[PDB]
Amino acid sequence: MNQFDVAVIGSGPGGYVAAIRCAQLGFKTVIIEKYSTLGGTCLNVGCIPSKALLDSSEHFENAKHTFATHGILIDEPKVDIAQMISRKNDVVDQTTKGINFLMDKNKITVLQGVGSFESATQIKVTKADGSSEVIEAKNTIIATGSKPSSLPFITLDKERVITSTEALNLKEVPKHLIVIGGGVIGLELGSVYLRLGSDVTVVEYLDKIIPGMDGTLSKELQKTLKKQGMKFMLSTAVSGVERNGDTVKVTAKDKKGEDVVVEGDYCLVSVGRRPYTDGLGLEKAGVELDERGRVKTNDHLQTNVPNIYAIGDVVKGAMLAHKAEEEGVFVAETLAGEKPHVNYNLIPGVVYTWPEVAGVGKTEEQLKEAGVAYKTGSFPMRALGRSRASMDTDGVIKILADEKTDEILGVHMIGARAADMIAEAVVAMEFRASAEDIARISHAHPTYTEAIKEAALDATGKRAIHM
Template sequence: MKTRSCQVLVIGGGPGGYPAAIRAGQLGLDTIIVDKHGLGGTCLNRGCIPSKAMIHAATKYEEMAKHAEDDALGISLAETPKLDMGKLVGWKDGIVSKLTGGVGQLLKAAGAEHIAGWANFKNAKTCVVDMDNGEQVEITAEHVILATGSVEVELPFLPFGDKVIGSTDALDLAEKPEKLVVVGAGYIGLELGIAFRKLGSEVTFIEASDGILPLYDKEITRPITMWLKKHKVAVNLSCKAKGMSEKDGMAVLEYEDAKGASQTIEADKILVAVGRKACLDGWGLENMGLDLDNGRFIKVDDQCRTGMRNVWAIGDVVGEPLLAHKATAQGELVAELIAGHRRVFDPVSIAAVCFTEPEVVGVGLTPDEAKAKGEETIVGKFPLAASGRYLSMEAGTDGGFVRITARKSDHVVLGIHAVGTHVSELSGEFALAVEMGARLEDISGTIHVHPTLTEGFAEAALTALGHPIHISAPKK
């Protein structure tokens, strides 16, 4: 067996691990990154990027299908577009391949070495890597950065297989399911379920809670609920999946409805999207002497340090929020700490986006959350139907809006939430405003470009101040 040593050993090549390795390499640290399942991790290979590619393709297909039915824009198609799932998946895979190749080049340019294989730790600083070429190498490091990520939650009574699939399998289907049942109406389930509905599948949701997207309030989720109803998507709330059988080549999902009665529903595929959990198994965590947070995540401090000296952990494996951009920020931070920089991970808030129809953006506190913290607030809400840019995008009827929650005493922005077509592109401005401690006057006083969706942000601030320009002033 070969032996190696390095200053920094990164385990996991996802959105936390590869930026950590790149930054460490840039800082002149001798760095090795070990990854088994493809540089870019779940986000790039099996999550964020391929799912957004699928959503984009589904949206384009739906739009083309509309033009085959009417010519409202003066555009018409002679026939309904044809869908080739194989080619769609191939196009998606091409995007993924291009980006993963780019990550490899960036690592090489930064001076970090990539070893393709699976690491198993003997102790906190030494692991044995079973490489993809069949060889083994033992690596000892001064610093270890754990970025093992998360995996899909598999229900014991609905194990993944031919009929029951997770989000990874859903992105690789060679054929569109005519009937799709989605267990879970959180952001993953809704994103994929809506995409398949756009592609023409009959979609039904089974959700255990009493609402979709449980992390958001009813005002935010109402436009999504409207879209689901308009597109004849059945959403069964307060229902619990129980198991699955097969009949005449179809999957039969058994579930308990809101009244406690037993029900069944047939489907070509059952997509289980009930969340993700930290990847803690199979790489020797038990040999490292690390503390866990409630047995679910690796416990770290505000510098991503574990209880073991010079062992760090970042991203999904350290807990909520399970977001790629959080992992990236932590990866860069840890590399700089190892290099001797002074840093702490203490964001005011981390923005989150749901690529549903319409999209949702949230950063900071909702009005109810602010109230629960004892804050007296003022809220400004601007309907995007009053935006010229929004109307020109054929999006004026989806119920979209931008909402700002600010402290009443000093007008400091506590939270920003929006729902609507393409509002994900506003997330950076929202996050910056909250992180920088902006006041309503800072936002309203910044000249926003016309015609863009960002004008809705300024108008929401003006509304909170009581004098909007493009809607009637709220009654005092």
């Protein structure tokens, strides 16, 4: 029997970052992955693939609609979908090799197979051929991640009634793509194919898109996506999804109770993500789940079995890749006798549409439900000289500040490069900065971040300069 200090089950962003941090702290560490390659959901069927298709489709969007204005003379651009998907596949293969490299550099043992608990200290690793080996580990970090949710009445066929996994591998640009469900994934992949020529209709039970974010962002994102051609059927309860050859028929009822029928040639189900624990052998180690199917954890991400921890999508909190990464570093440093901290209020959330959407801190709805006295500052992206020069003019920056102390309580962005502008707000809130603090700091001109500076001026005293 091989012996290790720490075992990590799952090779997603939480898993392999946790392993590296365990190796850096001196633990003999092993990581177990059932997939053929390392990287988890985010690399193989998640973040990296979506960003690659989003980047290529946005290039296609510019060529089709803005090149003439930009002074670039081309004929009607055409989509080579096989090259798009193939290039994305190479991007995934690139990142997988980098993760392999990191494992070797940190002297982490990598085992391919399904890891199941035999006890609180023994783990069975079953390879593809069915053979098994048992290893011993003093501590174990569960990082098994999540799987796509679905609806029980939908029969997924991996052809036309699909999830994000297959949607990233289409053999053609859909004529009419139907998106069932209000997950972020649906809006991102819908943007990809909307740009590539598809008709996209989002059919959703929820009353607004991205409802977990600030309401202004919900409003502005639907406003800009409609402007781009996406159609939205909100507050609509789907009751059926039929495949009839080359056609999918979605039947539902609207908020007034009337019947609704939507037909397309492709249907993507994006109704959320579900924690994944199948085959993990939790009963044999004694680890408890909650009513939602998540590994119960305490303040130290510890299960009821003291030597077993759990991180990432398999536990409570925002199901984000960098949230799993931070929790992995947290457990490793905790195992080393340190006292780390995670501020979950300061974990940003990003939507990778164009314009990008990003938020950190409290939403206005959260401040209202708590009876917090707050100020609002708001500056539009179209007023920036940088946006006029690039034609990326959609969106707004919104800052919430405590009315008495001026401390920034939440920053909510929709606009060009918001996925990276949000970092300024994260650092600002980490140092408990006031709106006045940010308003007085130099922001490079011309940049999109000047909208943050202007919004902070608006929040601190309604004294923005460029509005």
